[model samples]
Target: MTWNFHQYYTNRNDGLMGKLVLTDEEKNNLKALRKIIRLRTRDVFEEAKGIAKAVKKSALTFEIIQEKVSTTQIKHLSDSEQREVAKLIYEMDDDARDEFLGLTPRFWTQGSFQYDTLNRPFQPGQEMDIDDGTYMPMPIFESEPKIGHSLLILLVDASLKSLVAENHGWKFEAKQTCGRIKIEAEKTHINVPMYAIPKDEFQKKQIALEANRYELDSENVNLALREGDRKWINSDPKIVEDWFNDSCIRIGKHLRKVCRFMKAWRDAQWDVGGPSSISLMAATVNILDSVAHDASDLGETMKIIAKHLPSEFARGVESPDSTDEKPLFPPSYKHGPREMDIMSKLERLPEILSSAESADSKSEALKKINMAFGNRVTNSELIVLAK
Candidate 1:
C-alpha cells in the first residue's frame, strides 16, 4: 500500500512554531480593559439605536425611561449593595434588590418591561429564532462574558430585532437609538487569544501572501482612467469640464491604489487561501474599521471620563503618533451614563465583529460594539474594514 506524503505532514502547529506568547494571563487581562471598553461603548450605541428605532416607529419616547435608568448609581454603588445584588445574581434571581438599587439615586433600577412594552416581545421567549430560555433579560454587571459566547448573544439580540422589525413595523431612528446594548456587552466578555509572532517571521508570511496576492494588477485601474481620459483627448467635450473631470480621474486612480492595498485583506481571503488566523485577524480588524469610518465626524457625548485612553483609542486621534492617517471619527452618544467603566467593557470586540452578512448587518454590529465598550472602535480599524 502506498502511503500518501500528506499523511506524514501531520504537524499542524508548524506555521505557529516560532510565535512567542508575549503576554500571559495577567497582561492580557489588563489589555482587555480597552477591548472591554470598545465592547460596552458599542453596546450603549446598539441598545440606544434599538430603543430609538422602536420608539420612533411606535411613536413613543424612551427619553423618560433612559433618563430614569441613567440616574441610578450603577457606578458608585457600595460593596454591600453590590454584594446584595450579587447574592441575587448568585441565586439567579432577577427581581432581588430592586428596592435597594432602585431607590438609590445613581443606579437605574427600571425594569426591562419599560423597554419591552414599546416592542412586541415582553420577554425573551417571545423573541423569534433564539432559545433565550437560559438567558436572563436584565444585565448583571458583576459577571463578565467569555469571548466566544458574545457572538451568540449579539446574534440573539440582532435576530430578535429583525423579527420585531419585519414582523411588526419598526423604522430605526438615528444611529445612537438603534438598540443593540445587550449584544455589545456580550462581545466584550468573549476573548480572542493573541500570540506574538516576531516581526521578521511575520514579514515572511507577508511576503508569501504578497507573492501569491490576487490582482487585476495595474490594468484595471489604468483602463478606468484611460476611459475617463478619452473625453480630454477628443476635443468635442466641454474643455473646462473635461479638464476638471480628467484631474478627478487622476486623483481617483491614485486613491484606488491605496484602496487596493487595504482591500487586499478581504480580497486575499477569497482569491487565495491565506492562513485562517491571519485572515480572521485582518478581517476582524477591517470590520471594526468599517464602523469607525461610517461614523466619521460623529462626536462622542460621554467620553470626558477616560483619564488615560488605551493606545488603540489614540490610534486615530489628532496627535503626533495617531493611527489615523486622516481626521478621527468618534461615535455619538445621546443621553447615557455620565461616566462608567469603559475600559472594562471594550474587551468584547471579537464578538461584535463576528457577524458575517450584509453592510447593514455590519452596521448593526457596530451599534452593538459601541454600546458594549461605551467607546467607539478605533478609526483606523474602521477605515481598514471599509477598504
Candidate 2:
C-alpha cells in the first residue's frame, strides 16, 4: 500500500523502483516469472482465437464432404466415352442435312461437364446428363442461307432416329428443344440441343474443328437455342455454362465445389423436384461471400448457403446483370410448385447441417449426414475423409 507502484519511476527513480534489485539467484527467478506471465497470457489469447476458428473451420466436416463429393464419384463421362459420343454426334451431321435442309453443324462442349462441376445423379433410377451443343450454321447476311426452326428440329430428329436404329448401343428421343441420343448402360444421356450462332463468328471454330477432325472441344455458343414450331423463344439452353464460366474465374474454385455439394445435397433431398442447376449456382454465388467465407472450410460455407437460400430463392431466379433477357430458370419458378417444394426443403437444410456439424462421434455424424445427403454419403469413406 505504501509503495503506490502506479507512480513507478524511470532509472532516475521516484515512487518505488525495487529496493537493491536482486542477487544472481533472484535475477534468474525474475527471468523465469516474466516468461511464465508472457506465455500464460498468450495461451489464453490463443484459446479464445481457437474457439472462433472452430465454428467456421469445421475441418472434419469439410474433409468428409470434399472426399464424398468429387468429380470421380459424380462422373460425367470418361475420356474414351466422350470421344465415342463425339464421333457418333458428328456422324449424325452427315445424315442430318440432305439437299434442302443444308444445315452445316459445328460441335462444342458445355454445361457442368465442361465447367468441371458435373456430378453423378444421387437419386435412384435417375441418369446424369451430358450437354453437347451443335452449332448449326445459319445466315446472318440478307439472303445467303435459310431454314425454319421446325424444319431444323425435324431434320435432326430423323437423323438421330436413323442413327440410333443403325448404331448398336444408343437410343434416340425427341426432346423439348433438341435431339437426344444416349447409352442407357452408362446410366447417362447426351442432350444435343440445336444452337445457331453467327456464321461470321463461326470462322475460328470452323478452322479449329475442321483442322482437328470435328472434335467436340470449343467454347459454348451462348446465343439463343433454336426452339419453336411456328414461334421462337429467344433463350440459351447452354447459358449456365458461359454464365458460370465467368463466375468460376471471379468466384474462384471454392464456390464451384460448394455449388456441387449443394447440388448433390439438393439432388439427394428431392427425387422429383428441385431448383435448376443454374438457379442453385446463381443463388449460391449471389448469397455467399466468396471472399469473406472461409476458403478452407466448406462445411460452414455449406451451412451458410442453406441458411440464406429461403430468402435468395424466395425471389425469382436471376441471371447475371450482363446476361441477356433469357431467364436463368423457367419463369414460373418465381412462385410456383417448384418454389414451394424448394422452400420447404431450404427451411429444413440449416438444421440438418447443424446436427451433422455438432455430432461428437463419427457414428452420429455419418448417421445425420447420410440422413441429409442420402445413403450416398457414408462411413465407408470417412477414414480417408478424416483429414
Candidate 3:
C-alpha cells in the first residue's frame, strides 16, 4: 500500500523535521503566494527601472534578473533595452519620476524554496482552511522574526530620505541597518539600506573585473555597507553569489539539501546568532565528505561541521586577510565567550545522535533527533511518516 505521509501529516501537530514535504494543496497555496509576491515585486522593480532611466539616462547599466539562486548572471541590459527603459521614463511626469527614481528595490529573502531546506508548511499570517468553510490565521507565523517575506530598498536621494523622515509616517527607525519598514496586512517587510554603491558604471565594473581576476587582496573593491562612522566595509554581492553558485555545483546538488538541514537545525536550536547561513555553507564546503551525499549521514555531518567551525573561527581571527579581518562566521556567541555557544551545541550533538541510534522505534528516533535539534518537529507527524 502507498503510505500517505503528507495526507496524514497535513497541518497536524508534530510534523517532519525542517520544512515538511509540501502537500498538493499547500503547494498550490504557496504557488499563489509566490505569484502574488513576484508580480508585486516585479512591478516595483519595473517602476524603479523606469525612474532610474529618467534620472541616469544612458549612464544606467543595470538590468533586473530573477534572484541568482537559480543561475549565475550579471545580465546588464543592451543599448536598445536601455532606450526602451528611457521611453518608459519619458511617459511619466518629470517630478513624479524623479521622486520615484530616488528609490531602488532589490529582492532579498530566505525561504524553503530559496534553500530547499526543511521549513514549516505555513508562514505566519497564512490562512488555514477549516471544516466550517472558514479560514483561520496562525498567530505564531506572523510573530516569528525573519519568518515572512522581505524586500530591500535603497534610498538614493537625499530629498526622499528627508520626505520619509518628515512625512511618510509608518514607523521610521534610523540606524546602521538597511532602512526597515514593517507591514502588518501583508506580512511583508521592506528594508531600505543606507549604504553606498558605486555611482558610476565604470567603478561597478571594476569591482567585478578584479573579482574575476581573483585579486581579493589588492583590488579597490566597491563595497556595500551599513550606516556608521566605520561603515566603509567590503562587500561584493555578485562575487559572493558566484562563489556559492559554483561551490554548490562543485560539491554536488546534495550539498544544498545538507545546507538546508543545518539551517533548519539552527532554527530548531537557540537564536544566539550562532551561525549565519553563509557561514554554514562555507563550513559545509570546507569539510564536505563523500559520505555526506546520503541523507542518513546528516547527523554525522553536523558533528564534522560542528568541530570544523571553531577552527574556521580561529583562522578568520588569525589571518590578516580574512573578510572583516575578524572572527565572523559560525558567529560568536551573542552573550557568552566567543564561539562558546556553537561549541556547546556541537558537544551535545553526538549524544543526541547516540540516543537516536538506540531508539527502539522510528517514532522514538525522530523524537530524539528533534530534541537534539531543539523542539521544532512534532512526534505526531513522524508516527504517520514512519509507517
Candidate 4:
C-alpha cells in the first residue's frame, strides 16, 4: 500500500502524523477541559456584566442609569477617582482579569471565540499552538518589553482608557493620537494595545467601510491604530473568517484539511515570514474549482496549487489595485518574492507526489510526501485507533 495523504491527515485515528491528533483518552480529556474553559468563560462574563452593573450603582455624581456606562462619562472622572474605579475593576478572577485589562470579555458572542480548522478538537499539550481567533499584532514597545510575546488586540469602549491609564506599572502608548492605546502588561509581557471604537460606530460603519475594499474587508482599525493611523481600514476578523469558510464550503469541507496540510508545510519549511495562512487560503480558493472528490484529490489539489503559484508570483508585480484580480496584500500578500518563495516550495510537490505514486512501499511513499512538506507529513502509525 502507498501513503494515503488524505487518510494520514484527516483520519481521526492514526492520522495527522500524531502531531495533530489525540488518543481516545486524550481526546476525552481535552473535550472535558474545553467544556470547562468555555463554561468558565461564559460564567466569568456573566460575573463581569454583574460587576459592570454594580459599578453603575456607586452613586453617579452625574447622569442616570439607562444603559452601560458610556466612554465619555468614564473619561470625565477625576484622576484620583479614575484610579479608584480602575482598582475596583481589576478585582476580577483570573479568567476575567485580562478581559478587564483589554482582553475580549464575551466568549459566546458572534465574533468572540470561534473554532478553526487547524486548532479545533483541542489537544492536551498544544494549547499555545491553537488559534483562538484573537486578532493581535506584533508589539512595538517603548523599552525591552521582552521578546516573543503574543499581542492581544483589545477593542474596548472609551471607558477602558481610564482603567488602563490608572495602571502605573504598565506602559501605554498611543501612535494614532487618540484612537488606540498600546499597553505593556504590568506583570507579563503580553503587550495589549487597546483600540477605542464606539460600539455603535463599529456596528454602523463596519460593513460600509469594508465594502469599499471590494467586499474583501481585510482592513482592521485596531491594527491601523497600532501603525499610528486613526482611520478605519480593511481589518475585520469576521470578514476574513467568512471568506475562508465560504472557500471551504465551495471546495468541500476537506479543503480546510488541505489548508492545514499546507500550513504545516510552511511552518516546517519557512517558519518565520513566508506564505501566510490567508495567502495560502486565497491562492487555494482561486483554484478550488479544479478540485475533485477523490481521496487522492489532495495530491491533485496540491499540484494545482504548485502550478498556480507561478502566476500568483507574476501577478504580484501589478499594483494593489492595478487589475481586476483580487489583490493579496501584505502580512498575507502575494508580492515581493513571497510569490517566489512559495513557488519554490510548491514546485517540489509534483515531483514528490510522482515519487510517492511510484514508490514500492507505504513507508517510501510517506517519506516522499514528507519531503514535499519539508518532513511535515504525518505517518499513519503515529496515532492509536480512536475506539
Residue-level lDDT tens digits of model 2 in 189-260: 667676655555566656887788622222333233344342333445455566677777877776667777
Relative to the true structure, candidate 1 reaches a TM of 0.16
Return the TM-score for candidate 3, rounded to 2 decimals.
0.51
Cand. 3 Cα-lDDT? 0.42
Which of candidates 2 and 4 reaches a greater TM-score?
A: 2
Clashing pairs in model 2? 74-120
Each prediction's TM-score against the native? 0.16, 0.62, 0.51, 0.52
Ranking by lDDT: 2, 4, 3, 1
- Please write out the lDDT profile of model 1 over residues 143-237, one tens digit for every residue: 22111122223322333333234432332111211122122212211111111112333345457887995111111111001123221111111
Best by lDDT: 2
* Candidate 4 per-residue lDDT over residues 135-206, each given as its tens digit: 222122232111111111212222334444555653333443222223222111112223222333444555
lDDT for every model?
0.25, 0.52, 0.42, 0.43
Candidate 2 segments whose C-alpha is farther than 4 A from its true place: 1-103, 141-145, 167-170, 204-231, 236-239, 321-334, 380-387
Report each candidate's C-alpha RMSD, comma-separated, in the order given.
Answer: 27.5, 25.7, 14.7, 12.1
Cα lDDT of model 4 overall? 0.43
